[PDB]
GROMACS .gro file of C-alpha atoms in nm:
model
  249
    1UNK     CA    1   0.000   0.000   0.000
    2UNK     CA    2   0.097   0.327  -0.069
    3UNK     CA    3   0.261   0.561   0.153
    4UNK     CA    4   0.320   0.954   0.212
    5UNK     CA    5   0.625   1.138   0.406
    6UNK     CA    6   0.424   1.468   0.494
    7UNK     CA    7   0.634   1.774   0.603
    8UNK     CA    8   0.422   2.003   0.871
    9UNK     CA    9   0.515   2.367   0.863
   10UNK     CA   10   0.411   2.551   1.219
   11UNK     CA   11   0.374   2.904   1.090
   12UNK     CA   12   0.320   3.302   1.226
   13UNK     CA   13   0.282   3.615   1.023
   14UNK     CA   14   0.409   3.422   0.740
   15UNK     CA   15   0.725   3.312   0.905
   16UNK     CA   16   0.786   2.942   0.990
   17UNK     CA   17   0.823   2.921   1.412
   18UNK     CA   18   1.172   2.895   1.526
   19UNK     CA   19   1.290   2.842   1.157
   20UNK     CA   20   1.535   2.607   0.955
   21UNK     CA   21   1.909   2.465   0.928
   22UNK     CA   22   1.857   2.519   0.541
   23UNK     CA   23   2.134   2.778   0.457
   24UNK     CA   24   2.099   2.727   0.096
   25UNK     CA   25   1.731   2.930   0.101
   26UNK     CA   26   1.745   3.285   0.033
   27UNK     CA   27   1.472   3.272   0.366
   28UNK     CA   28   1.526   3.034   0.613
   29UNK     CA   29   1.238   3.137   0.744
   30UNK     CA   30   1.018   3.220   0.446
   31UNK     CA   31   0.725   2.911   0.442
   32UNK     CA   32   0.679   2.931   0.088
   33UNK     CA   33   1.034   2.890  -0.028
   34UNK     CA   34   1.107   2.587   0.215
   35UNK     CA   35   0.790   2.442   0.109
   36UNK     CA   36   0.921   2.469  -0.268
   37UNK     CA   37   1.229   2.297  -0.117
   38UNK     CA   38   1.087   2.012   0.003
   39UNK     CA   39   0.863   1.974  -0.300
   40UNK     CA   40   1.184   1.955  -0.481
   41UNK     CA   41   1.372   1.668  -0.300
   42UNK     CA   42   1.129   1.454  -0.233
   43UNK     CA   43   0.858   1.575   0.008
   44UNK     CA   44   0.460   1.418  -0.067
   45UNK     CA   45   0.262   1.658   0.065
   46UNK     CA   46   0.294   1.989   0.320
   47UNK     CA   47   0.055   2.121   0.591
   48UNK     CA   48   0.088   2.445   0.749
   49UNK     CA   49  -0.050   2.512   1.041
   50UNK     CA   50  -0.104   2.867   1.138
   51UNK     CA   51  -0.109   3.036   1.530
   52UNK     CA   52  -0.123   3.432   1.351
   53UNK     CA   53  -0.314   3.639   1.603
   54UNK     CA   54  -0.712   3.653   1.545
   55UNK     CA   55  -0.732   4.017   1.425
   56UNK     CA   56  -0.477   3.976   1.096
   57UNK     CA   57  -0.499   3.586   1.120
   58UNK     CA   58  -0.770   3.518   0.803
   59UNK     CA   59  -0.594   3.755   0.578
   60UNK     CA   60  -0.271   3.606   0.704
   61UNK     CA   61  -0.369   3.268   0.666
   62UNK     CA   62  -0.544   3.390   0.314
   63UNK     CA   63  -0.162   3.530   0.170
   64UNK     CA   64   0.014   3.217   0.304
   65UNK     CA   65  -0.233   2.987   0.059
   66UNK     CA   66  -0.183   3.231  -0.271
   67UNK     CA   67   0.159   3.252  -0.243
   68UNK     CA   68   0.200   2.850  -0.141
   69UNK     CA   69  -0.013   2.775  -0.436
   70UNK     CA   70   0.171   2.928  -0.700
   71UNK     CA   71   0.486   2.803  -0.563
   72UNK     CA   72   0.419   2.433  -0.538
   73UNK     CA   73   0.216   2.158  -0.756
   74UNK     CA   74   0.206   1.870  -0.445
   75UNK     CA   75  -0.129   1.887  -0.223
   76UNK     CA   76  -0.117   2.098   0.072
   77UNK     CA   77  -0.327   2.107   0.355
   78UNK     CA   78  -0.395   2.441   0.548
   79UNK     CA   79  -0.493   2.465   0.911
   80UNK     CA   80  -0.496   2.600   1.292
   81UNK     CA   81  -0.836   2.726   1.472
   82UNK     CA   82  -1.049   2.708   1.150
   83UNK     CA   83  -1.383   2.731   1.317
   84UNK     CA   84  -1.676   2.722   1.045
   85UNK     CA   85  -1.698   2.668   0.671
   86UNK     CA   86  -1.694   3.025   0.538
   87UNK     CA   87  -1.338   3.008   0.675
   88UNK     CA   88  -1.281   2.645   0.548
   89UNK     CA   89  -1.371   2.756   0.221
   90UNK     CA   90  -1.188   3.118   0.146
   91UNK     CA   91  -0.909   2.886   0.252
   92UNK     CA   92  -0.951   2.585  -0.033
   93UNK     CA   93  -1.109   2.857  -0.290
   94UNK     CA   94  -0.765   3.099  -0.261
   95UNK     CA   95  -0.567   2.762  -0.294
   96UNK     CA   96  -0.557   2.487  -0.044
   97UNK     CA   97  -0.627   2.186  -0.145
   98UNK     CA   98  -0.759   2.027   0.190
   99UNK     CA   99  -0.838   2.204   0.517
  100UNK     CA  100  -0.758   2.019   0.869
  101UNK     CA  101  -1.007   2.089   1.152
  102UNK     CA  102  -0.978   1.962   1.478
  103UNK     CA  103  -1.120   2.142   1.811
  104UNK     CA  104  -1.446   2.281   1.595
  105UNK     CA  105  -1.516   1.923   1.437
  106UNK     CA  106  -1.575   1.841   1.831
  107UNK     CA  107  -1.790   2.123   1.895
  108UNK     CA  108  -1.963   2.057   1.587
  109UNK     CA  109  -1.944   1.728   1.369
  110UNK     CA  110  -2.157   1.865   1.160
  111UNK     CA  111  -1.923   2.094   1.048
  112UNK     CA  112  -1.753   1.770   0.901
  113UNK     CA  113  -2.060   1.717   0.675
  114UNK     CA  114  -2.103   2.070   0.553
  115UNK     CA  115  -1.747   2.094   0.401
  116UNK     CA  116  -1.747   1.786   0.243
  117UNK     CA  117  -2.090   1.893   0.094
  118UNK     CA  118  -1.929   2.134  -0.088
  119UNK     CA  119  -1.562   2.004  -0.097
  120UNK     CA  120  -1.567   1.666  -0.101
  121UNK     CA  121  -1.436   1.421   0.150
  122UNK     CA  122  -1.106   1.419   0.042
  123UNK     CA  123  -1.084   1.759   0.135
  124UNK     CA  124  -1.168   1.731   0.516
  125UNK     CA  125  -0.887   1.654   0.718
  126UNK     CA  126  -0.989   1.627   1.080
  127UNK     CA  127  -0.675   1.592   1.291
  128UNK     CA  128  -0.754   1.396   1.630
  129UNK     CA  129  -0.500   1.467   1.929
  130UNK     CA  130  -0.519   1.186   2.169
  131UNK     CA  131  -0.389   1.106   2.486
  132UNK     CA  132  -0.403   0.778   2.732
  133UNK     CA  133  -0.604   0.894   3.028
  134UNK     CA  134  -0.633   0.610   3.305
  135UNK     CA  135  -0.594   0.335   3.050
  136UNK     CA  136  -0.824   0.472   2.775
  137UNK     CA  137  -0.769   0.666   2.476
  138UNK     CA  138  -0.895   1.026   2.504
  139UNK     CA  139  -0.954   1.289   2.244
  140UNK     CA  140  -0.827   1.635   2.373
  141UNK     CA  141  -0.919   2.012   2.220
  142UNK     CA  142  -0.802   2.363   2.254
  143UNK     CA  143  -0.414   2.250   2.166
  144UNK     CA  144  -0.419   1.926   2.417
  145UNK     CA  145  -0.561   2.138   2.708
  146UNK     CA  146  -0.917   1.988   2.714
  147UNK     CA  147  -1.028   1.650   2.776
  148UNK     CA  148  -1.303   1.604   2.600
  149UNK     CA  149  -1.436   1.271   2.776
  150UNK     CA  150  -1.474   1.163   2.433
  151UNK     CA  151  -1.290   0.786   2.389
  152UNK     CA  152  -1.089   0.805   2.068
  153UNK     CA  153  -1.222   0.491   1.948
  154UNK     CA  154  -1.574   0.661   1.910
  155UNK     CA  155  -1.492   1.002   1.732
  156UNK     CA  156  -1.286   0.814   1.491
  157UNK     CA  157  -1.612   0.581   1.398
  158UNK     CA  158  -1.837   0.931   1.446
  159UNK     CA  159  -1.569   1.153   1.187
  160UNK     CA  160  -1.583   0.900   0.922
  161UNK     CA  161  -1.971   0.863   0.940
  162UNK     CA  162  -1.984   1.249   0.935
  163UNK     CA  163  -1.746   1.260   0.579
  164UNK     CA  164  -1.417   1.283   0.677
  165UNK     CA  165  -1.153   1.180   0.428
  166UNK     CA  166  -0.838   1.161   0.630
  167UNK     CA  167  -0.775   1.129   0.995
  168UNK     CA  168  -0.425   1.330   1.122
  169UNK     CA  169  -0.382   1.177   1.438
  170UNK     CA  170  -0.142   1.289   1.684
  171UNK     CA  171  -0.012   1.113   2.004
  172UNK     CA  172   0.029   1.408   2.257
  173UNK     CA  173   0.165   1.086   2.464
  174UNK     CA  174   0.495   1.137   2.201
  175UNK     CA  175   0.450   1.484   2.037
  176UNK     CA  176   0.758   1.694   2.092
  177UNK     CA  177   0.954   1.370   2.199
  178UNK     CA  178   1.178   1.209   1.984
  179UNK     CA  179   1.113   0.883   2.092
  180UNK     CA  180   0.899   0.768   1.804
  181UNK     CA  181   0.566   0.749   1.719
  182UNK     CA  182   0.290   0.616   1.913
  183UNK     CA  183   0.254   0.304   1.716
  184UNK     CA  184   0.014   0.114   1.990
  185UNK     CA  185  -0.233   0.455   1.923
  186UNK     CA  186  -0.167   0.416   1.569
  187UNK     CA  187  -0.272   0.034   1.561
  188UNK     CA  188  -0.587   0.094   1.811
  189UNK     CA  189  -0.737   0.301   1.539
  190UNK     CA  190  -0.645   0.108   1.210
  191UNK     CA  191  -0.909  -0.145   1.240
  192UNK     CA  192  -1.186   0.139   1.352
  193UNK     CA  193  -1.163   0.289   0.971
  194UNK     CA  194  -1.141   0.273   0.612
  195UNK     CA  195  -1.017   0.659   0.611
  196UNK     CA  196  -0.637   0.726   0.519
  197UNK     CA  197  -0.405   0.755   0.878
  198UNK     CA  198  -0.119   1.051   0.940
  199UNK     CA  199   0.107   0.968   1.211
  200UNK     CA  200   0.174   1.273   1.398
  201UNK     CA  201   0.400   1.308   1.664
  202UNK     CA  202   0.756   1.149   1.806
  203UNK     CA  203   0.929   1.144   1.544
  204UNK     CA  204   1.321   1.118   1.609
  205UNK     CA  205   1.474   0.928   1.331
  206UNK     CA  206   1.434   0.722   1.014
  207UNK     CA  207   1.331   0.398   1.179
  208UNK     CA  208   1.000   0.535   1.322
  209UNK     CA  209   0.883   0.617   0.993
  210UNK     CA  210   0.934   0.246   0.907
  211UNK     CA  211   0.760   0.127   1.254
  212UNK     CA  212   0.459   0.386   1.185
  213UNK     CA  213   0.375   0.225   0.853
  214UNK     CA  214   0.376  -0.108   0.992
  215UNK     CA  215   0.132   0.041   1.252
  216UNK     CA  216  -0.069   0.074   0.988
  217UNK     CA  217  -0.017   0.457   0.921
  218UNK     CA  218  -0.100   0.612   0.556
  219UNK     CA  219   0.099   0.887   0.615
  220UNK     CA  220   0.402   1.019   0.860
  221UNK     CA  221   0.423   1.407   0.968
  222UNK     CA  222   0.685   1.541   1.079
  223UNK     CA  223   0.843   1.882   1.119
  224UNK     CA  224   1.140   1.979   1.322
  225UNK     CA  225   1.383   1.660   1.222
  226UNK     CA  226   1.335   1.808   0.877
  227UNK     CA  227   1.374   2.156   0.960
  228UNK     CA  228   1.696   2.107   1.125
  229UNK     CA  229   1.783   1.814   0.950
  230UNK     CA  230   1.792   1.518   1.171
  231UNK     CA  231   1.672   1.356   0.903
  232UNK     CA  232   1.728   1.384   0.542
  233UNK     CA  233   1.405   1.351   0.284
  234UNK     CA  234   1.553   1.186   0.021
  235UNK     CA  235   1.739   0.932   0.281
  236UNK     CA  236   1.468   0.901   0.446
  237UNK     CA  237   1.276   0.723   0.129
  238UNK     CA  238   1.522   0.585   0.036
  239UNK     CA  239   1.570   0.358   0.364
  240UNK     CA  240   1.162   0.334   0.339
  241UNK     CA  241   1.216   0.167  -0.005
  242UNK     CA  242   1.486  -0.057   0.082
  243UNK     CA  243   1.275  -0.220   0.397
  244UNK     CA  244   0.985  -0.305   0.144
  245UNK     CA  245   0.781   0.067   0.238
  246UNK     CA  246   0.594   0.176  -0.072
  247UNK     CA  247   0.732   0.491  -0.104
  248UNK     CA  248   0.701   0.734  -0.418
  249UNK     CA  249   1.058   0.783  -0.588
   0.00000   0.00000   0.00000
């Protein structure tokens, strides 16, 4: 089965938080040309997820899409509190190719539905951010800082019923940590859907890549390594290949 190395690109004002190692850009910093770069050697797919304050943050958000658009021919996905569809859809209209909700698809799973009305499935991502809470798995909002009560084994059923097309789900158990990804969350949800899977979260070096797509994972996020180059794109699918991963090269 096919699989995707996704590069996530936190982002501010147009500026990519705490920047890159890559002293061959022009901008370091600049989200549009270190997208282009990893377009370039080898990258599937980007999503940039923006924390611009609210009063310049949906014109922000709005420039970041043109300009990524025009740059770049591989999907992106654009997110970061995008709380109803006339936001969701500015966003995909000016360029973005899939929009990633997370604490509003809680609030509302309706919200789900009405995108993918309009959008189709495919372009609802709903990113899930899970966490083990006395031996269950619980979904948490508001940037990990709610628990929801909601067990992650029933919003997973609930956002593909709703019309979902890709879950992005991130162990806050491993997020931050280099330790690898959280491939016990990452098999717990497998058999609960038909919907593509994005690891998010923990990952340190190339052999969690390989570990996630056993798990089952689709897809593999990851930001920092890449930004400060840990970990090498091109070496990364490279080593994919060679352990029988079907990787695009």
């Amino acid at each position: 089965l096919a699989k995707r190395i996704i590069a996530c690109l936190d982002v501010k004002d147009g500026r990519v938080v705490k920047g890159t190692n890559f002293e061959n850009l022009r901008d370091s910093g600049d989200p549009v040309e270190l997208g282009k770069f990893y377009s370039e050697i080898g990258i599937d797919e980007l999503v940039f997820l923006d924390i611009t304050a609210s009063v310049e943050k949906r014109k922000t958000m709005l420039e970041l899409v043109e300009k990524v658009a025009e740059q770049i021919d591989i999907p992106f996905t654009v997110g970061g509190g995008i709380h109803d569809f006339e936001t969701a859809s500015e966003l995909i209209l000016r360029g973005a190719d899939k929009v990633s909700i997370n604490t509003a698809a809680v609030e509302n799973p309706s919200l789900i539905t009405q995108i993918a009305q309009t959008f189709g499935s495919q372009a609802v991502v709903v990113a899930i951010d899970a966490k083990r809470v006395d031996g269950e798995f619980m979904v948490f909002t508001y940037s990990g800082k709610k628990n929801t009560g909601i067990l992650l084994r029933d919003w997973v059923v609930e956002v593909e019923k709703r019309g979902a097309g890709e879950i992005l789900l991130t162990s806050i158990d491993r997020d931050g940590t280099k330790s690898g990804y959280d491939t016990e969350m990452i098999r717990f949800v497998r058999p609960l859907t038909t919907l593509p899977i994005i690891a998010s979260g923990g990952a340190g070096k190339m052999e969690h890549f390989l570990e996630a797509f056993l798990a089952g994972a689709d897809a593999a996020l990851a930001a920092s390594v890449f930004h400060f180059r840990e970990i090498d794109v091109r070496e990364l699918k490279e080593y994919l290949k060679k352990h029988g991963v079907n990787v695009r090269l």
